[PDB]
């Protein structure tokens, strides 16, 4: 569980925001892309795995699970690629509530930024630093350090 | 010390690789951009500060220290923007040796990737996971967790 992440793709302004959530902490990384292709998802997973110790990724949909480009990046980076079936139905609701929270944040910053990508990175910053108290950025570091120890 | 990062800009293939180094661990993040502008540097710092607790950034040159766009991003993200003067001459050599190591790695992967950006993210992954023994990615998590606790 220190190494488990969930992909999530949501849409705004006719663009796609791809998110990776560290399931045990709720810390996220995200980017804006024009569309959700196996090449864009594969590159995003390569970035993520170079920055945190990603053991397993639950893909966001069947097309990213099938994509041989995504499987190729998961092989390269040493990630176990898994499906994203919500056997725990709580997963469905957590993801939905997270997307609604990020879009709320993005609305709150949106007029400080000309481009959507800036607003999404402002929202990643606000989400990860929010204390709910520890923040998600503190929880992720704690969880992984405890694992390393 | 847990919150101190150094920016570094190096060139390959006619493109610019912008790197942020977490000084106490040697962990890095990096990206490829067509050229090193204050807007590109500001967006990179906004990304980095949403992902790790960035207290202080030593800028890589005087143009990024002066840039009001960079200062605007460091204000937004709560980062102290500092110069990059190597008062400890050991700094110069550490950075030069890191750029040579990264280019070495990029060359060892370069033929697995069509685009430079893929090779650079492969190099970030190899650098951060290399055991020298702990890796830089282990050291950064330990350092920050120790600070949090």
């Amino acid at each position: 569980s220190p190494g488990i992440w969930q992909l999530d793709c949501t849409h705004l302004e006719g663009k796609v925001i791809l998110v990776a959530v560290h399931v045990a902490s709720g810390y996220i990384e995200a980017e804006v892309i024009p569309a959700e292709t196996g090449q864009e998802t594969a590159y995003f997973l390569l970035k993520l795995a170079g920055r945190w110790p990603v053991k397993t990724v639950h893909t966001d949909n069947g097309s990213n699970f099938t994509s041989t480009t995504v499987k190729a990046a998961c092989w390269w980076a040493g990630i176990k690629q898994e499906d994203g079936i919500p056997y725990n139905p709580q997963s469905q609701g957590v993801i939905e509530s997270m997307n609604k929270e990020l879009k709320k944040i993005i609305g709150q910053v949106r007029d400080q930024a000309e481009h959507l990508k800036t607003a999404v990175q402002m929202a990643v910053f606000i989400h990860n630093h929010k204390r709910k108290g520890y923040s998600a950025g503190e929880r992720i570091v704690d969880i992984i350090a405890t694992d390393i120890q | 010390s847990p919150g101190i990062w150094q920016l570094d800009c190096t060139h390959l293939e006619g493109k610019v690789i912008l790197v942020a180094v977490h000084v106490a661990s040697g962990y890095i993040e990096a990206e490829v951009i067509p050229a090193e502008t204050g807007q590109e540097t500001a967006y990179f710092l906004l990304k980095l500060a949403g992902r790790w607790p960035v207290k202080t950034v030593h800028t890589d040159n005087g143009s990024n220290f002066t840039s009001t766009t960079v200062k605007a991003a460091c204000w937004w993200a709560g980062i102290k923007q500092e110069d990059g003067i190597p008062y400890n001459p050991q700094s110069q050599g550490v950075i030069e040796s890191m750029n040579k190591e990264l280019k070495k790695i990029i060359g060892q992967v370069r033929d697995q990737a069509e685009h430079l950006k893929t090779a650079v993210q492969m190099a970030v992954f190899i650098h951060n996971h290399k055991r020298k023994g702990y890796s830089a990615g282990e050291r950064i998590v330990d350092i920050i967790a120790t600070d949090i606790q």
């Binding site: 090449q39 594969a42 590159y43 041989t68 480009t69 190729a72 990046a73 390269w76 | 697995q112 990737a113 069509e114 685009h115 893929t118 492969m122």
Partner: peptide, 8 residues
């Protein structure tokens, strides 16, 4: 293209 980022 036989590359990780372009399998073609």
């Amino acid at each position: 293209a036989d590359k990780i980022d372009n399998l073609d």
